[PDB]
Design an enzyme around this catalytic site. Structure first.
Site, PDB file in Angstrom:
ATOM      1  N   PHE A  75      23.164 -80.189 -54.207  1.00 10.61           N
ATOM      2  CA  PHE A  75      24.299 -79.437 -54.623  1.00 10.61           C
ATOM      3  C   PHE A  75      24.939 -80.589 -55.709  1.00 10.61           C
ATOM      4  O   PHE A  75      25.152 -81.669 -55.055  1.00 10.61           O
ATOM      5  CB  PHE A  75      24.962 -79.103 -53.462  1.00 10.61           C
ATOM      6  CG  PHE A  75      26.374 -77.968 -54.030  1.00 10.61           C
ATOM      7  CD1 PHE A  75      25.902 -76.755 -54.632  1.00 10.61           C
ATOM      8  CD2 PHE A  75      27.602 -78.577 -53.820  1.00 10.61           C
ATOM      9  CE1 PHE A  75      26.939 -75.799 -54.969  1.00 10.61           C
ATOM     10  CE2 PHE A  75      28.888 -77.469 -54.508  1.00 10.61           C
ATOM     11  CZ  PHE A  75      28.252 -76.355 -54.592  1.00 10.61           C
ATOM     12  N   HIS A  90      31.740 -82.244 -57.153  1.00  8.48           N
ATOM     13  CA  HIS A  90      32.488 -81.078 -57.182  1.00  8.48           C
ATOM     14  C   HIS A  90      33.632 -81.775 -56.226  1.00  8.48           C
ATOM     15  O   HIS A  90      33.653 -82.618 -55.489  1.00  8.48           O
ATOM     16  CB  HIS A  90      32.026 -79.953 -56.615  1.00  8.48           C
ATOM     17  CG  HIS A  90      31.719 -79.778 -54.988  1.00  8.48           C
ATOM     18  ND1 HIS A  90      30.542 -80.389 -54.603  1.00  8.48           N
ATOM     19  CD2 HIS A  90      32.427 -79.599 -53.821  1.00  8.48           C
ATOM     20  CE1 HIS A  90      30.485 -80.502 -53.455  1.00  8.48           C
ATOM     21  NE2 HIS A  90      31.478 -80.103 -52.786  1.00  8.48           N
ATOM     22  N   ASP A 118      36.522 -79.863 -53.565  1.00  8.62           N
ATOM     23  CA  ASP A 118      36.705 -78.695 -52.531  1.00  8.62           C
ATOM     24  C   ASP A 118      37.677 -77.866 -52.934  1.00  8.62           C
ATOM     25  O   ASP A 118      38.594 -78.188 -53.465  1.00  8.62           O
ATOM     26  CB  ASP A 118      36.618 -79.251 -51.104  1.00  8.62           C
ATOM     27  CG  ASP A 118      35.440 -79.650 -50.475  1.00  8.62           C
ATOM     28  OD1 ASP A 118      34.475 -79.837 -51.319  1.00  8.62           O
ATOM     29  OD2 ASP A 118      35.576 -79.966 -49.438  1.00  8.62           O
ATOM     30  N   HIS A 157      32.556 -85.387 -54.455  1.00 11.37           N
ATOM     31  CA  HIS A 157      31.439 -85.497 -53.676  1.00 11.37           C
ATOM     32  C   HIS A 157      30.126 -84.695 -54.134  1.00 11.37           C
ATOM     33  O   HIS A 157      30.436 -83.712 -54.796  1.00 11.37           O
ATOM     34  CB  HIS A 157      31.746 -85.566 -52.043  1.00 11.37           C
ATOM     35  CG  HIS A 157      32.282 -84.386 -51.827  1.00 11.37           C
ATOM     36  ND1 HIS A 157      33.463 -83.920 -52.332  1.00 11.37           N
ATOM     37  CD2 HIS A 157      31.839 -83.107 -51.240  1.00 11.37           C
ATOM     38  CE1 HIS A 157      33.883 -82.716 -51.678  1.00 11.37           C
ATOM     39  NE2 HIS A 157      32.713 -82.237 -51.087  1.00 11.37           N
TER      40      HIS A 157
END
Ligand code: V20
Ligand code: FE2
Length: 329
Positions: free
Chosen positions: A209, A212, A214, A268
């Site tokens: 993933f 981004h 959160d 992260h």
């Protein structure tokens, strides 16, 4: 060749009690971590995470394909138009490894005024058959309230850290209306692991993933003991050590908005690892109409040039943007 991120362990137990000085010493540790890499582990949090992991494993490993379709969100099952958030998110063998189950506030019942009004981001949870998954719904709802309690305590610490009274955030975080969610993510072992299911970062790192921030106020995360997370710092991406005894905590972009980036939402990403593991976030979301006036703890008058943003607006836009950026999970 990647260095280890500074992610301190903070004993949050004083946040459950009435020793105000000890709460301030916890608040300071939160402030420090929040200004450094943006991550810390909450230890002495009181939650039985081994049992969480076990019950979650039992579910993931026993749910059948028939059940996953029956529980599927709209993105996988067009029959389920009301399930935008809550339900099952299917894997796609050969293409997509991850799968998960999302649920919201157990108090979002058919008679809840926001469900009656069909307000966006509010849904009634879907559950599997009790006879096929005995105890699961009750275990999961109880877990929601256990992690809600931890999150309330954590929010007391963030409020104190920012120079506010301890209920500054927690007053907007209420059992009857919170938009908080639990996600029970299964990251599988696969042999062979399809290349299609592995992304590649600009720096060559294999990912599951992408990078981004959160969509949350804060995020309260349990993971298995398999190293996979990285945080972008001024020194580049650094590895977050795994710790399956604590909760990994970080700020989301609503906290960054409120604080004028004094507590940034750390960027992260998730490394690809061929290991059967769990990622079990609790996204600490406020109520649909919750508005906190933005401020800035680095400015003498505390004032910010940011405008108030209601949590419901923030959340609906955030979740759509995250899907656009990083794909449907
Ligand atoms: C380390 S990022 C945490 C976890 O990733 C997620 O949960 C990602 C990025 S934070 N979040 C989402 O996809 C948003 C889920 C929101 C949820 N469906 C909801 O309706 O509240 C993972 O992949 O291990
Ligand atoms: Fe995340």
């Amino acid at each position: 060749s990647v260095s280890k991120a500074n992610v301190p362990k903070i004993d949050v137990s004083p946040l459950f009690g009435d020793d105000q000085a000890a709460k301030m010493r916890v608040a300071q540790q939160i402030d420090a971590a929040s200004r450094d890499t943006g991550f810390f582990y909450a230890v002495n949090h009181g939650i039985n995470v081994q049992r969480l992991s076990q019950k979650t494993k039992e579910f993931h490993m026993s749910i059948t394909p028939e059940e996953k379709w029956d529980l599927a969100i709209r993105a996988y099952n067009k029959e389920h138009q009301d399930q935008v958030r809550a339900g099952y998110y299917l894997s796609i063998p050969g293409k997509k490894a991850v799968e998960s189950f999302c649920y919201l506030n157990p108090n979002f019942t058919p008679d809840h005024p926001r469900i009656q009004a069909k307000t966006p981001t509010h849904e009634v949870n879907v559950w599997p058959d009790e006879t096929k998954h005995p105890g699961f719904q009750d275990f999961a709802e109880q877990y929601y309230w256990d992690v809600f309690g931890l999150s309330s305590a954590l929010l007391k610490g963030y409020a104190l850290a920012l120079g506010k009274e301890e209920n500054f955030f927690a007053r907007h975080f209420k059992p009857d209306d919170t938009l908080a969610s639990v996600v029970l993510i299964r990251y599988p072992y696969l042999d062979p692991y399809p290349e299609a299911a592995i992304k590649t970062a600009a720096d060559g790192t294999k990912l599951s993933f992408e990078w981004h921030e959160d969509v949350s106020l804060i995020t309260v995360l349990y993971q298995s003991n398999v190293q996979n997370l990285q945080v972008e710092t001024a020194a580049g991406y650094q590895d977050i050590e795994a710790d399956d005894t604590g909760y990994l905590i970080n700020c989301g972009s609503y906290m960054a908005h409120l604080t004028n980036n004094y507590y940034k939402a750390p960027i992260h990403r998730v490394k690809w690892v061929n290991a059967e593991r769990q990622s079990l976030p609790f996204f600490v979301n406020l109520g649909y109409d919750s508005v906190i006036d933005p401020f800035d703890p680095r400015e003498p008058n505390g004032k910010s040039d940011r405008e108030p943003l209601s949590y419901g607006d923030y959340l609906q836009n955030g979740l759509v943007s995250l899907i656009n950026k990083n794909g449907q999970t």
